[PDB]
Amino acid sequence: ALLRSGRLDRKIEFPMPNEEARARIMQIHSRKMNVSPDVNYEELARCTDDFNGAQCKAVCVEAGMIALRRGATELTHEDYMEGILEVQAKKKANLQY
Amino acid sequence: TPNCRVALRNDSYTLHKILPDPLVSLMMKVPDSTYEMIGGLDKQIKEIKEVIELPVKHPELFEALGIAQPKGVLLYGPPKTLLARAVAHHTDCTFIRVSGSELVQKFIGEGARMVRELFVMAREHAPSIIFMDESEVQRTMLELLNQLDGFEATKNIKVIMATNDILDSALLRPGRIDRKIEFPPPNEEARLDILKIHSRKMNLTRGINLRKIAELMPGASGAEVKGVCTEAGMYALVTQEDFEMAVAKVMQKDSEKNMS
Amino acid sequence: KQEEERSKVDDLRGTPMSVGTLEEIIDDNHAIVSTSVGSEHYVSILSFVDKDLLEPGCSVLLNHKVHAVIGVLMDDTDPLVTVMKVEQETYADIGGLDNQIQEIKESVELPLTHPEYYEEMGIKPPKGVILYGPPGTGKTLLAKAVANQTSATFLRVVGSELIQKYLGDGPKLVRELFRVAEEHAPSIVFIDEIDAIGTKRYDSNSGGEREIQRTMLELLNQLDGFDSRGDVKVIMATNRIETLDPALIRPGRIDRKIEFPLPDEKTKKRIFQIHTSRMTLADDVTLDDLIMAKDDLSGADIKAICTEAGLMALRERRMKVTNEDFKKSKENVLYKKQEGTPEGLYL
Amino acid sequence: AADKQTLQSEQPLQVARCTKIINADSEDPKYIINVKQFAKFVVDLSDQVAPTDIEEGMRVGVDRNKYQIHIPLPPKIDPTVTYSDVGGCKEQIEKLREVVETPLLHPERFVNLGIEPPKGVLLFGGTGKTLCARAVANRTDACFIRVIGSELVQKYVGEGARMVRELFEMARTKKACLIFFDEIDAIGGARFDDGAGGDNEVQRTMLELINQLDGFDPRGNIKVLMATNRPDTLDPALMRPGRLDRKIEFSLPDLEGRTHIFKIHARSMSVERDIRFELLARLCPNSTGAEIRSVCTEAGMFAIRARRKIATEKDFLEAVNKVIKSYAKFSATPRYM
Amino acid sequence: EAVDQNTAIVGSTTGSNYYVRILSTIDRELLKPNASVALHKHSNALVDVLPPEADSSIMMLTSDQKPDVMYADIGGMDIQKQEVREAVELPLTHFELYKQIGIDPPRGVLMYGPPGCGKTMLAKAVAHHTTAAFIRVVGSEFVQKYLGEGPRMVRDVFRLAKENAPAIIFIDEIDAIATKRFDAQTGADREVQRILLELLNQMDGFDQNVNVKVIMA
Ligand SMILES: Nc1ncnc2c1ncn2[C@@H]1O[C@H](COP(=O)(O)OP(=O)(O)OP(O)(O)=S)[C@@H](O)[C@H]1O
Ligand SMILES: Nc1ncnc2c1ncn2[C@@H]1O[C@H](COP(=O)(O)OP(=O)(O)OP(O)(O)=S)[C@@H](O)[C@H]1O
Ligand SMILES: Nc1ncnc2c1ncn2[C@@H]1O[C@H](COP(=O)(O)OP(=O)(O)OP(O)(O)=S)[C@@H](O)[C@H]1O
DSSP: OOSSSSSSOOOOOOOOOOSHHHHHHHHHHTTTSOOOSOOOHHHHHHTSOSOOHHHHHHHHHHHHHHHHHHTOSSOOHHHHHHHHTSOTTOOOOOOOO | OTTOOOBOOTTTOOOOBOOOOOHHHHHOOOOOOOSTTTTTOOHHHHHHIIIIITTTSOHHHHTTTTOOOOOOOOOOSOOOHHHHHHTGGGGOSSOOOOOOOSOTTTTSSSSOTTTHHHHHHHHHOSSOOBOOOOOHHHHHHHHHHHHSSSOSSSSSTTBOOOOOOOSOTTTTSTTTOOOOOOOOOOOHHHHHHHHHHHTSSSOOOSSOOOHHHHHHSSSOOSTHHHHHHHHHHHHHOOOHHHHHHHHHHHHOSSOOOSOO | OHHHHHHHHHHHSOSSOEEEEOOSOOOSSEEOOOBTTOOOSOEEBOSTTTSSSSOTTOEEEEOSSSOOEEEEOOOOOOTTHHHHSOOOOSOSSOOSOSSHHHHHIIIIIHHHHOOOSTTTTTOOOOOOEEEOOSSSSSSHHHHHHHHHSSSSOEEEEEGGGGOOOSTTHHHHHHHHHHHHHHHTOSOEEEEEOOOTTSSOOOSSSOOTTTTTHHHHHHHHHHHTSSSOOSSOBOOBOOSOSSSSOTTTTSTTTOOEEEOOOOOOHHHHHHHHHHHHTTSOOOTTSOHHHHHHHTOOOOSHHHHHHHHHHHHHHHHTTOSSOOHHHHHHHHHHHSOSOOOSSSSOSOO | OOSTTTTTTSTTOOOOOOOEEOOOOSSSOOOEEESSSSOOEEOOOOSSSOSSTTOSSSBOEEOSSSOOEEOOOOOSOSTTOOOTTOSOSHHHHHHHHHHHHHHHHOTTTTTTTTSOOOOOOOOBOOOOHHHHHHHHHHHHSSOOBOOOTTTTOOOSTTHHHHHHHHHHHHHHHSSSEEEEEOOHHHHOSSOOOOTTSOTTHHHHHHHHHHHHSSSSSOOSSEEEEEOOSOSOSOOTTTOOTTTOOOOOBOOOOOSHHHHHHHHHHHHTSSBOTTOOSHHHHHHOOSOOHHHHHHHHHHHHHHHHHTTOSSBOTTHHHHHHIIIIIISSSSSOOOSOO | OEEETTEEEEOOSSSOOEEEEBOTTSOGGGSSSOOEEEEOTTTOOEEEEESOOSOOSSTTOSSOOOOOOOSTTSSSOHHHHHHHIIIIITTTTOSSHHHHTTOOOOOOOOOOOOTTOOHHHHHHHHHHHOOSOOOEEOGGGGOOSSTTHHHHHHHHHHHHHHHHOSSOOEEOOOTTTSOOOOOOSSSOHHHHHHHHHHHHHHHSSOOSSSSOOOOOO
């Protein structure tokens, strides 16, 4: 009763950013915040496959705050890889037997 | 005197005189009949005496004791109104079935702000009955805790409720009502006496066994003999067969064996 | 002279002297009053008669024509002074908690009377205890016995005594009783059956969602919030545990909590001899049978049972009380009691 | 009779009832008013007033007959709003330290980095939402102003927003401030709307907050903290790196923060030094610091019963019997090994 | 309440009870009830008191609400048809046939109409052949917001009923109204309270000369 023909006509999906759409969103996060240009977003996007925006947004913010840890003025692909290789919203493990 | 509605003018509010609101709304009356239709259910009447006339008849016998008088008996049980009204009616002076019970949301609380105004009346009207039925409830319960603790005109007056008990069980504390007396329905002896009673005035086909009628009543609720008389007369419109068919209409369901 | 000064102070007054609650201390010889319907102008306030003695939110004398502040209200009294402003001690019949007495002692009197320990061991006095259980087992009874067993003038405050539907009369009684607790003495403001927020309503009362809600807000802000304890013992005991707002379940508001079972055989015989003493006992009757059968005697059955047993007997004017009279007394008192199987079916 | 005739001489004026405002129109202000409770009044003021000193949501003076606005007053005034622990729940400490000090101290780790200075926290959690703010008070500078969202549950329209401006500008006067809003669970994170016509002072107040917190003279040398027990009901307006941008959380520490708080409250009172805590720590299954503080209180109760000065681990043993067995819930553990 | 000669405290309907004087010529034995007094606006000077007021919103409908029906016209309910016919139309007017067997003065009765019935139709047939002060109502009209609305409704109904003539009146709603299940503390605490209270207190056991034999179905 909610989608037939006059209420919500079109129903198009939001596919997961495929491989470099993720990196696109990521550099959208990774543009204003000053970056050391030695950052190839290709490796980043590749080494974290099936990674939705939020994760990538959490990746770039993590990298920003990582360069903030040392107090840097730039963003190194090291910190970018750190965000890529962060918890990625994955845990933990125990690992318990 | 304090708390006195007196003569005042909206003109300049210079108090003028002193005047002495809903008294009669509760204070307003059944001079009923006798026990002629009770016939064997008289032990409960004896208890009525023991617990009601004791706050009435001889205060000099338990004030000599020195211990407080009773307030409530919870004259509950199988639904009692009729005879519980008509019996101490014979006193015709203390039976004041004010009872506040009809208007649950208007006469009670919202006008019985503190029912002590009615307690005031009782202090003027020691011959007055207090029937009752079902936090306003708990509020008036606190009012009871203040009053009926051996403290009234006749010190206990008549502070009783009756129903037929799963409300707020706070009242169930005996310190709020002493006795708790169900109404055992009439049985073979009582049922037969009331059989002769309810068959008294109707010009029946006289000379008829009423014992089998009393028995066919499995502890009928008192006036059911009258109703069977009504069912009988209707068939005749009174032989024993009349009352037989009367109970047959009355008693059927119970029916439907094949489950023994 | 002085008589002329008083005559002039009366000249300032209008014959119909309305009443209006002050809103705020604004002392340009005019205030912002609030009469029974809230007449809030910049009405003058009589200067010589004390204009600033009364606080905001306090009743004052008001005019009719301009509703000017006529003066400080008369000495008003709440209907609970005789119960609160108090003009049986430890135990007249020892045979109950025999312990919660001592614990409420250590929680109320010992802190209040000798508060030289909370700096002796870096501690804090118990700002609140709750005591609860069945409808009469030793909760409020202990408080009643603690009222006499103390070096201070205890105060009795029925939890429902604070239920008056007048505008702010809830907060008004809070203010009054608290000005007492703080500006009368170190007192014992005992308030019982305070669990009245949960599952019922009244006919002699308006919508409590917006009538006693701000009332309870005032009461809470007063007791254990702002204008804090100091040494103001106002402890809140109860009967239930459930229906309450957890805005105070958290500590600070009230710290400790205590329950009440029903008394045991050792205490059953105790309160028996306490109550069975009120009658020339036919010693052939078996208290222990009553004690084990009625093994859950909160404290009302014992009293009621023995009083009604005396009534049963002295109906016949007998001195002794045969066992059957005790049976009848208790079973009248003890309705709806079936403790057999289950269980009922063992040993 | 020191002034018994001046009061009879002030008489020439009797005007300006309470007369609260509602809103205002255009092409002329036409402020809208209710006097006390009677009705809505789209008034036109007495032109001898200011077209803006009658800010809607104020009890202003207003004619008794024509209801034109007159000399106002807010007789509702200010009385409405009420650290060695540095190192607690471990991970929380670093993120808190960064978000507080690094913008307050070095806008270089981010500005030059282009990232923004972490200036907000979405905290969720016996966790210690205040104790963290106080460990920050050790570090912000020396400023700590408690404003609990519970007291912030007020029933006057704009009075909440007015307190918003009050606190926001009192903070901007000082520096390195702390403003601790809690019970945002009770305040609300998702913009629940009901036709009850009730909790909308929260609406205007929170939009005013959005306006005045960060951006439009941001907190800067000030920390205004709104946090929850749970990030359950968020809003796309709060995840902004300008408003709250750390999202720390903590819960029951295992035993180490536990033992630490044990010792904290111990030295905070007359205790025996020869006692240990890891033993007591094992005793502690799951508890907040206040519960533990309650253990300390019960030890004090024993030391009030018996004349103790250095509260011994036997006093604490009885206190543990209480808190964890006689207060674990009631007593219902024993009679089976 | 009255204080002195032709002067009484009298409840208002405006919002302020007053203690006013009355026209003395009024029979002194008529100012006892809270009946429909009448006074001047400003003077509030009692001129006279009126017995009736505030009808029960159906007031028997007073015209020819009689569906103009005879016995067999009902859609086939011969059991109830005969029963109601000879046990109502004769007993509703009689004094001696019941007494010719001392039967009793009668009281309420009951019907129940399932699918493919007409139990209500029988009621309307009798409503035709009845020719006295019968008022029709529905118990559903007793459930509102404030206190005792429907309770006071049925109360004043009883009053005006025993007042006009103890002949006949009927109401038609039983389900979700006459609810024996007093036992659920979830919904209709005061609502079902006042509902079933009015029901039983108006049962009165009975009243034996009023509103003879309301039915429901
Ligand atoms: N020292 C005692 N210990 C325990 N019980 C006692 C003691 N002394 C007397 N009692 C009994 O305990 C009862 C005390 O009941 P209360 O708690 O005062 O009743 P209550 O406070 O009205 O209860 P509620 O919840 O308000 S209905 C009395 O009826 C005594 O018989
Ligand atoms: N992590 C901690 N470090 C030091 N003291 C603590 C800690 N946790 C609790 N306490 C102490 O125990 C008491 C508990 O108070 P709070 O932690 O403020 O209570 P709370 O209910 O957790 O507060 P909220 O709801 O999170 S604002 C405080 O008075 C502290 O002194
Ligand atoms: N034989 C019929 N001829 C015409 N209409 C009929 C007939 N029987 C029933 N009806 C309709 O049903 C109504 C009267 O019958 P009722 O006794 O009220 O029915 P019922 O037993 O209440 O069944 P419900 O209420 O519809 S489930 C009238 O409004 C008619 O329209």
